Amino acid sequence: SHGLFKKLGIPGPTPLPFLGNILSYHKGFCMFDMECHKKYGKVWGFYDGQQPVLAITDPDMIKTVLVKECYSVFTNRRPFGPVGFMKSAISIAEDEEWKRLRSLLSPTFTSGKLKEMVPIIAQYGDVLVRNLRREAETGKPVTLKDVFGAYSMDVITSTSFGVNIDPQDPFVENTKKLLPFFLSITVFPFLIPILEVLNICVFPREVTNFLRKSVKRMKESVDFLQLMIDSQNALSDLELVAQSIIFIFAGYETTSSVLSFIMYELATHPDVQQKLQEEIDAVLPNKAPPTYDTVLQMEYLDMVVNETLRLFPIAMRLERVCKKDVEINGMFIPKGVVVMIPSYALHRDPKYWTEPEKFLPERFSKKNKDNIDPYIYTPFGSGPRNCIGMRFALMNMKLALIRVLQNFSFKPCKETQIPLKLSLGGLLQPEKPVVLKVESR
Amino acid sequence: SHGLFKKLGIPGPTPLPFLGNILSYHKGFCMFDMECHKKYGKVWGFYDGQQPVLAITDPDMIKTVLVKECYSVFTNRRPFGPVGFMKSAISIAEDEEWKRLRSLLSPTFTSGKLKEMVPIIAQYGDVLVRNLRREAETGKPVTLKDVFGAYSMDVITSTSFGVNIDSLNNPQDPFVENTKKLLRFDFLDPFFLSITVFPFLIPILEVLNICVFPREVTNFLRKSVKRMKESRLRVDFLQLMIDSQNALSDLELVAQSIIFIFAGYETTSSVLSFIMYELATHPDVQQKLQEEIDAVLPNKAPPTYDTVLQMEYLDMVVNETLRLFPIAMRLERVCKKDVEINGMFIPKGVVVMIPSYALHRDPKYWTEPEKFLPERFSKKNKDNIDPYIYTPFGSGPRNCIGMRFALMNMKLALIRVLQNFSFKPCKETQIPLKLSLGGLLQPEKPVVLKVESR
Ligand code: HEM
Ligand code: HEM
Ligand SMILES: CC(C)(C)OC(=O)N[C@H](CS[C@H](Cc1ccccc1)C(=O)NCCCc1cccnc1)Cc1ccccc1
Ligand SMILES: CC(C)(C)OC(=O)N[C@H](CS[C@H](Cc1ccccc1)C(=O)NCCCc1cccnc1)Cc1ccccc1
C-alpha cells in the first residue's frame, strides 16, 4: 500500500515499512513539511504508517477541499481513536452527527452573543491587571502562559456556563494534562478497534471523570450550556459532556498560548509594541473599558494578531479525508487518502511573503492585505468546517491585549529565550516557557 | 456666518451674500480648487452659499480626517438631498446606519469574490472584442463611452445579481439608458444651483416626494430589482443582502443596488475612456503596454486573476490616468464637533474638503503635472508618492468599497481589448481634451477614436 504515490506520479519521500515517513518527524511536523515543500514542489505525498497523506499547496485546490467539496467529499478529518465517549466531540464527529452538532453549537458565537460576553470578560480583565501589578511592582519575570491560562480559563468557564471558578485551580491543572505514545496509533491503525469494542481510551480517566462530574455540577437546572439543554428537551447527556471538554480545552490552551506568542514578539519589537500602545490610548483614552466596537476598530491590533498567527499557527496543519474517488484541479485523489494542507509551511513560503522569518505587521495592512491569499494564510482553517470559535478567540485575545497594554509594558529578561525555539515535538509550543519583564505605566 | 474664516485667520475668496463663493464655479470645481491652492496656500476656506467649507492639503491633516478621526469626528459626508428613499444608500447613510451597511457589503469584494468574477467578466470580454471588431473592419470612429458603458453594465449586473440583461447589443438597452439619466448634476440647471447654495430648501422637497433622481428611473429600478429576485432557482451581491435580511429592509436593498449599478456603469466606462484617450495620443505608451500584455499572455492567452496582478505597466497606466482624472474630484467630510487637529481648530458643522484634483496636479509634488507620464508610479518612483496626496479612491474606513473591483474590471477590459486592437485619434477627436466646465468630471466632447485590428 506504499506504492500508491509512485503509481499516481505524485512525488514524495521514500517510506519505510510499517513506519512509513514518521522517522522524518524527528525535527517536527513543521520542519518536515517545509523540507518537503522545497524538495518536491507544490504537491507531494507521504505516509503516516500505512495511512497515505497527500499534501497540497495550490490555493485553488485548497479551496476545493475546504470550501467547495466539504459536504460531498472532504467532510471529516483523520479518524482519531481510541477516544471512548469523546467520539461525539464536534472536532472528531463525522458526517451526519457533525452537521447536527455544528448547527447546534453555531449560535454560541453570534454577534449578539459575542456582544453579551464583553461585560463578562471586562470583569476578568481587571483581575488580570491586578495580578500583573503584583508581579510588576516586584521585579520578577512573569511566566505568561501561567497568568494567561488563568485568564483564559475564567472566560470560557463563564461565557459558556455562567459559573465562576476564579493558583492551583483543579480545572487548569486537569485541562493542561491532556498534553508521546501515539507513535503506535500511526503505526497500528488496526489497534484502534482493538480498544473500542473493549472500551479503552487515550485520554487519562481522571481528566475525563472529573470533567464529566464537573459538567454535572454545572447542570444547575443564554449560555453555551443553556443552548445544549434547550436543544435536548436529540442531544444526549454524555454527548453534552464531550462538547464541554472541547470548549474548555480550546478556550484555555489556544487563547493563552497565542497570547504568550504575541507578548514575546511585542517585547522583542519595541517600536511595534509602542505603536500599538499609542493606538490603544487614542481609541481608548484614560484607560477606558473596551467595547465590541472599539475592539474591531483597532486595526493595528488586528495586524499584530494576524501576523503572530501567521508565524505561530497552533494547528500547524489542516487535514481532510477523501471519502470517494474524485479528481480536483486535474489531479486524482483515491478514496481514503488524507488530504493535508501545511499551514505552517505556507505561512512562511518565500513565494508568498517577503522575509517570511521576520515579524512584520505591515503585511496585514489594508494597503498590503490585498496581496494575501486567504487559502495560503489559514490560521483558523476555512470552509464549513473551520474554527467555530474563531470570532470568539480573536475577541478574547484582543480584549486581553487592550486591557494589559493600557497599564503595562513588556521587556525581555536574561532568561527570555531569544530567539524563541519552538518545541521540536508535536504541538506548537516554545521549548522554554515564555518569560518577560513587566513594567508599570 | 460668512465671517467664520475671517475669525479663524483662514484665508479664502471673499463670499457674496446668500450665494457665497458659488459664482467662482463658472469654470468648474477643479479650476476653482486649483486657483485657491495657488493663491492661499496649504489651507483655505470658502462658502457653498452659507455652508463653510474648509479645504485641507496637508498629508497629516488629510490622514487625520480620513483615517484617524473617522469614526469619532469625520464620519459622514455633506448632506445630499432631496433623495427620498435613497437616504438609506451606503454612500449617503450616516453614523450607525452606514456602519451597519458598510460591514454588510464589505464581503462583496473580497479576494475570493473577485477571483470568482473573472470567468464571468471573461465572457463579456469576448463580446466586447466582437463588437469592437465590427466598427474596426469598417473605418468608423467609435464613441468609447457607448461601447464601454454597455460592457460595464454587463459586468456589474452579472457579478452582483447573476442576471444577463444586455445580450449581443442591444444599443437601446433600458438599463444603460435609465442609469445614464439617473443623476445629471448641472449648475446651469437652477434646481441644483438652487439648492447646494441654500439648505433651507431640502425638507420641503422631501415632503413633496421631490427627489434629485427622476421618478421614471427610480420606479423602473424599483421593479427591476424586484424582478431580479429569482429564488428558489452562486453567492453574489444580491445573495449577501437576502442572507443578511432573513435587519435589512426590502426597499433598502434597492437603495444599495442602485448605487452599485450606477458606480459599475459610470465610473468604469468614464475612466476607461480617459485611459484610451491617453493611449491613442501616446502611441509609445500604448505600444509598451501592448508588449507587456503579450509577454504575460502570449498567443492571446485569456486573462486570469493572478496574471492581472503581474502586469506593472498596466497598473502604471491606470494610476496615472486616475491622477489626471479623479472622477470624484473632491473628498468631503462633515465635522460633527469642535476639534483641534494638527494645531488647527475646526468648528462643528464645517465641511472638510480634500481637493483631490488640485493635489494630483500640484507642481510641488508632481514634476510636470499636466503631462501623461506613467513612469511616476513605477517601482523606482512609487516610493516618492504620498498616499494621502494621490487619493483616487479616497482613504480610510469610508473609501471606495469597489476599488479592487473597479481596478479589475477596467484592467480585464484593457487586456482583452489591447490584445486585438490598437487605437489612433481621428479628425473629430478633441485634442487636447477639454473637461466639462459643469459639475461631474466628464469631457466636453465625447472621446472618439479609430479602432484598427491586429
Ligand atoms: C487562536 C485561537 C484558535 C485557533 C488558531 C484555532 C484554530 C483552529 C483550526 C485551524 C481549526 C480547524 C479548521 C479546519 O480544519 O479547517 C479549528 C477547529 C475548531 N475550533 Fe479552533 N482555534 C482557536 C481557538 C478556538 C476556541 C477559543 C474555540 C472555542 C470553542 C475553538 C473551537 C474549535 C472547534 C470546536 C473546532 C472543530 C470544528 C469542527 O470540527 O467542525 N477554537 N480551530
Ligand atoms: C475608477 C473607478 C472608481 C473610482 C475612481 C472611485 C472613487 C471613489 C471615491 C474617491 C470615493 C470616496 C472615498 C472617500 O470619500 O474617502 C468612492 C466612494 C464609493 N464608491 Fe467608488 N470609485 C470607483 C468605482 C466604484 C465601483 C465599481 C463601485 C462598486 C460598488 C463603487 C462604489 C462606491 C461606494 C459604495 C462608495 C461610498 C462608500 C461609503 O460611503 O462608505 N465605486 N469612490
Ligand atoms: C496531534 C494529534 C496527532 C495528537 O492529533 C490531534 O489531536 N489532532 C486533532 C484530532 S482529535 C483532538 C484530540 C483532543 C485534544 C484535546 C482535548 C480533547 C481532544 C481534538 O479533537 N481537539 C479539539 C481541540 C479544540 C481546538 C484546538 C486548537 C484550535 N482550535 C480548537 C485534529 C484537530 C487539530 C487542530 C484543530 C482541530 C482539529
Ligand atoms: C455633484 C454632486 C453634488 C452630486 O456631488 C457629489 O457627487 N457628491 C456625492 C453626494 S451623493 C451622490 C448622488 C448620486 C449620484 C448618482 C447616482 C446616485 C446618487 C452619491 O451618493 N453617489 C454614489 C455613486 C457611486 C460612486 C460614484 C463615483 C465613484 N464611486 C462610486 C458624494 C460622493 C462622492 C464620491 C463618491 C461617493 C460619494
CSV table of C-alpha atoms in Angstrom, one decimal, chain A residues 112-292:
chain,number,residue,atom,x,y,z
A,112,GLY,CA,-25.3,39.3,19.6
A,113,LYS,CA,-24.0,36.6,21.9
A,114,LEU,CA,-20.4,37.9,21.5
A,115,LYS,CA,-21.6,41.4,22.4
A,116,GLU,CA,-23.0,39.9,25.7
A,117,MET,CA,-19.7,38.4,26.6
A,118,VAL,CA,-17.8,41.7,26.6
A,119,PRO,CA,-19.1,42.8,30.0
A,120,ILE,CA,-18.3,39.3,31.4
A,121,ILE,CA,-14.7,39.4,30.1
A,122,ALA,CA,-14.4,43.0,31.2
A,123,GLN,CA,-14.5,41.7,34.8
A,124,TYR,CA,-11.7,39.2,34.3
A,125,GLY,CA,-9.7,41.9,32.5
A,126,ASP,CA,-9.3,43.8,35.8
A,127,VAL,CA,-8.1,40.9,37.9
A,128,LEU,CA,-5.5,40.2,35.1
A,129,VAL,CA,-4.2,43.8,35.6
A,130,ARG,CA,-4.3,43.4,39.3
A,131,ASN,CA,-2.3,40.1,39.4
A,132,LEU,CA,0.2,41.5,36.9
A,133,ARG,CA,0.6,44.6,39.0
A,134,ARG,CA,1.8,42.5,41.9
A,135,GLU,CA,4.4,41.0,39.6
A,136,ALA,CA,5.2,44.5,38.2
A,137,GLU,CA,5.9,46.3,41.5
A,138,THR,CA,8.1,43.4,42.4
A,139,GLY,CA,10.9,42.8,39.9
A,140,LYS,CA,10.1,39.2,39.0
A,141,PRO,CA,9.9,37.7,35.5
A,142,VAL,CA,6.4,36.5,34.7
A,143,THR,CA,5.5,33.1,33.3
A,144,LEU,CA,3.0,34.5,30.9
A,145,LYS,CA,1.2,31.2,29.9
A,146,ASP,CA,0.5,30.8,33.6
A,147,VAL,CA,-1.4,34.0,34.2
A,148,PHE,CA,-2.8,34.0,30.7
A,149,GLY,CA,-4.0,30.4,31.3
A,150,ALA,CA,-5.8,31.6,34.4
A,151,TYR,CA,-7.4,34.4,32.5
A,152,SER,CA,-8.3,32.1,29.6
A,153,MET,CA,-9.9,29.6,31.9
A,154,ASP,CA,-12.2,32.1,33.6
A,155,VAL,CA,-13.5,33.4,30.2
A,156,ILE,CA,-14.5,30.1,28.7
A,157,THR,CA,-16.0,28.8,32.0
A,158,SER,CA,-18.2,31.9,32.4
A,159,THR,CA,-19.1,32.9,28.8
A,160,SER,CA,-20.2,29.2,28.2
A,161,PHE,CA,-21.5,28.0,31.6
A,162,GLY,CA,-22.1,31.1,33.8
A,163,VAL,CA,-20.0,29.6,36.6
A,164,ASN,CA,-17.2,31.4,38.4
A,165,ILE,CA,-14.1,29.4,39.2
A,166,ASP,CA,-11.7,32.3,39.9
A,167,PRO,CA,-3.1,29.4,41.5
A,168,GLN,CA,-3.7,25.6,41.8
A,169,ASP,CA,-7.2,25.5,40.4
A,170,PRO,CA,-8.0,21.8,39.7
A,171,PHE,CA,-9.5,22.7,36.3
A,172,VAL,CA,-6.4,24.4,34.9
A,173,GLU,CA,-4.4,21.5,36.4
A,174,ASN,CA,-6.6,18.9,34.8
A,175,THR,CA,-7.2,20.7,31.5
A,176,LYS,CA,-3.4,21.1,30.9
A,177,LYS,CA,-2.5,17.4,31.4
A,178,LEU,CA,-4.1,16.4,28.1
A,179,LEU,CA,-0.6,17.3,26.9
A,180,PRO,CA,4.1,10.6,23.2
A,181,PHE,CA,2.8,7.0,22.8
A,182,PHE,CA,0.8,7.9,19.7
A,183,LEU,CA,3.8,6.7,17.8
A,184,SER,CA,1.8,3.4,17.9
A,185,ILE,CA,-1.6,4.6,16.5
A,186,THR,CA,0.1,5.9,13.4
A,187,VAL,CA,1.7,2.5,13.0
A,188,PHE,CA,-1.2,0.4,14.4
A,189,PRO,CA,-4.4,1.8,12.9
A,190,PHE,CA,-5.8,-1.7,13.3
A,191,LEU,CA,-5.3,-1.4,17.1
A,192,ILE,CA,-7.9,1.4,17.2
A,193,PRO,CA,-10.9,-1.1,17.1
A,194,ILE,CA,-8.9,-3.3,19.5
A,195,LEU,CA,-9.6,-0.7,22.2
A,196,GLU,CA,-13.0,0.5,21.0
A,197,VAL,CA,-15.2,-2.7,21.4
A,198,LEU,CA,-13.2,-3.4,24.6
A,199,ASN,CA,-13.5,0.2,25.8
A,200,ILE,CA,-10.0,1.6,26.2
A,201,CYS,CA,-9.2,5.3,25.6
A,202,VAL,CA,-6.2,7.5,25.1
A,203,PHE,CA,-7.3,10.3,27.4
A,204,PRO,CA,-6.5,9.7,31.1
A,205,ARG,CA,-9.6,8.6,33.0
A,206,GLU,CA,-9.1,11.2,35.8
A,207,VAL,CA,-9.2,14.2,33.5
A,208,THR,CA,-12.4,12.9,31.9
A,209,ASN,CA,-14.1,11.6,35.1
A,210,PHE,CA,-13.5,14.9,36.8
A,211,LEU,CA,-14.8,17.0,33.8
A,212,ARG,CA,-17.8,14.6,33.4
A,213,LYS,CA,-18.6,15.2,37.1
A,214,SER,CA,-17.9,18.9,36.8
A,215,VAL,CA,-20.4,19.4,33.9
A,216,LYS,CA,-23.0,17.5,36.1
A,217,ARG,CA,-22.4,20.1,38.8
A,218,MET,CA,-22.7,22.8,36.1
A,219,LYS,CA,-26.1,21.3,35.3
A,220,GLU,CA,-28.0,23.7,37.6
A,221,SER,CA,-31.5,23.4,36.2
A,222,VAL,CA,-28.5,32.2,27.2
A,223,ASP,CA,-25.2,30.3,27.6
A,224,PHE,CA,-23.4,27.7,25.6
A,225,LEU,CA,-24.7,25.2,28.2
A,226,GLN,CA,-28.2,26.7,28.1
A,227,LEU,CA,-28.2,26.1,24.3
A,228,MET,CA,-27.4,22.4,24.8
A,229,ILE,CA,-30.3,21.8,27.3
A,230,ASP,CA,-32.9,23.7,25.2
A,231,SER,CA,-31.8,21.6,22.2
A,232,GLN,CA,-32.2,18.5,24.5
A,233,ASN,CA,-35.8,18.9,25.7
A,234,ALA,CA,-31.9,14.8,20.2
A,235,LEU,CA,-28.8,15.5,22.4
A,236,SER,CA,-27.6,13.0,24.9
A,237,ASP,CA,-26.3,13.7,28.4
A,238,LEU,CA,-22.9,12.0,27.7
A,239,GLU,CA,-22.6,13.8,24.4
A,240,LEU,CA,-23.2,17.1,26.3
A,241,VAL,CA,-20.1,16.4,28.4
A,242,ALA,CA,-17.9,15.7,25.3
A,243,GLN,CA,-18.7,19.1,23.7
A,244,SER,CA,-17.8,20.9,27.0
A,245,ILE,CA,-14.4,19.3,27.2
A,246,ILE,CA,-13.6,20.6,23.7
A,247,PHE,CA,-14.8,24.1,24.6
A,248,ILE,CA,-12.9,24.1,27.9
A,249,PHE,CA,-9.7,22.9,26.3
A,250,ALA,CA,-10.0,25.2,23.3
A,251,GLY,CA,-10.7,28.2,25.5
A,252,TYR,CA,-7.7,27.6,27.8
A,253,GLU,CA,-4.9,26.1,25.7
A,254,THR,CA,-5.4,28.1,22.5
A,255,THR,CA,-6.1,31.6,23.7
A,256,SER,CA,-3.4,31.6,26.4
A,257,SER,CA,-0.7,30.1,24.2
A,258,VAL,CA,-1.3,32.6,21.4
A,259,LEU,CA,-1.3,35.4,23.9
A,260,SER,CA,2.1,34.2,25.1
A,261,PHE,CA,3.2,34.2,21.4
A,262,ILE,CA,2.0,37.8,21.0
A,263,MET,CA,3.8,39.3,24.1
A,264,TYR,CA,7.1,37.7,23.1
A,265,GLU,CA,7.0,39.5,19.7
A,266,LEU,CA,6.0,42.8,21.2
A,267,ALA,CA,8.8,42.7,23.8
A,268,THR,CA,11.3,41.7,21.1
A,269,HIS,CA,10.0,44.5,18.8
A,270,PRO,CA,9.8,47.7,20.9
A,271,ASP,CA,8.6,50.0,18.1
A,272,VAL,CA,5.8,47.6,17.3
A,273,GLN,CA,4.7,47.5,21.0
A,274,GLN,CA,5.0,51.2,21.3
A,275,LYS,CA,2.9,51.9,18.2
A,276,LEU,CA,0.2,49.6,19.5
A,277,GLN,CA,0.0,51.3,22.9
A,278,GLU,CA,-0.4,54.7,21.2
A,279,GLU,CA,-3.3,53.5,19.1
A,280,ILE,CA,-5.0,51.9,22.2
A,281,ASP,CA,-4.6,55.2,24.1
A,282,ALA,CA,-6.1,57.1,21.1
A,283,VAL,CA,-9.2,54.9,20.7
A,284,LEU,CA,-9.5,54.3,24.4
A,285,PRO,CA,-8.1,57.3,26.4
A,286,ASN,CA,-7.9,57.4,30.2
A,287,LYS,CA,-7.8,53.6,30.2
A,288,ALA,CA,-11.4,53.4,29.1
A,289,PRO,CA,-13.1,50.0,29.2
A,290,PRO,CA,-13.1,48.4,25.8
A,291,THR,CA,-16.3,47.6,23.9
A,292,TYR,CA,-17.2,45.3,21.0
